[PDB]
Amino acid sequence: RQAITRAMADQARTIRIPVHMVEVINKLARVQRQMLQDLGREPTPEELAKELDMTPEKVIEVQKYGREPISLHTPLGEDGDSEFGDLIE
DNA sequence: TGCGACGGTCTGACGCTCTACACAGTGCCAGGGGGAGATAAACGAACGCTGAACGCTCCGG
Numbered sequence: 001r002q003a004i005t006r007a008m009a010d011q012a013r014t015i016r017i018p019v020h021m022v023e024v025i026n027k028l029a030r031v032q033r034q035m036l037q038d039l040g041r042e043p044t045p046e047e048l049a050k051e052l053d054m055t056p057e058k059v060i061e062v063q064k065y066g067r068e069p070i071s072l073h074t075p076l077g078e079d080g081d082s083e084f085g086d087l088i089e
Numbered sequence: 090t091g092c093g094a095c096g097g098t099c100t101g102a103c104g105c106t107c108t109a110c111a112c113a114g115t116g117c118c119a120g121g122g123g124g125a126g127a128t129a130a131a132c133g134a135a136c137g138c139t140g141a142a143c144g145c146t147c148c149g150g
Contacts, residue, residue, distance in 0.1 A: 002117095023116080023118090026116085027117085068112095070111085076109060076110065077110080079109090082109075084110090084111095
């Protein structure tokens with residue numbers, strides 16, 4: 001489990017994230033999911049900040065860092081030739 | 090070896106803009122090494138103060 005999650009931290013994401021930041025973001029994700037299934041609603045970032053004992057600015061920074069890139073080759077729709085990479089200057 | 094046929098492999102499948110969008114279910118902490126920022130001191134520099142000192146026009150008894 002240790003080696004698999006270490007390689008998941010160091011290799012799964014294209015923009016590499018250090019292992020401590022990976023465990024921080026997935027702990028935040030799992031406690032957010034727990035609060036969502038308990039309260040039945042999306043938890044406010046302030047309550048997440050108090051329950052994680054971190055500052056709200058740290059919480060929103062963590063949510064910002066927890067993203068996934070989108071490929072430049074995703075088609076828009078019916079047309080195959082018009083790409084997502086040709087709409088950005 | 091000749092035979093069809095069986096099968097995989099491979100290719101494109103008129104043109105443009107007006108329009109045009111985004112992407113989702115399973116761990117956790119302690120010990121240790123580096124460099125970012127604050128600290129108070131340091132060797133050297135030039136920055137000021139000291140008016141003194143040279144020289145001028147100067148109103149002058």
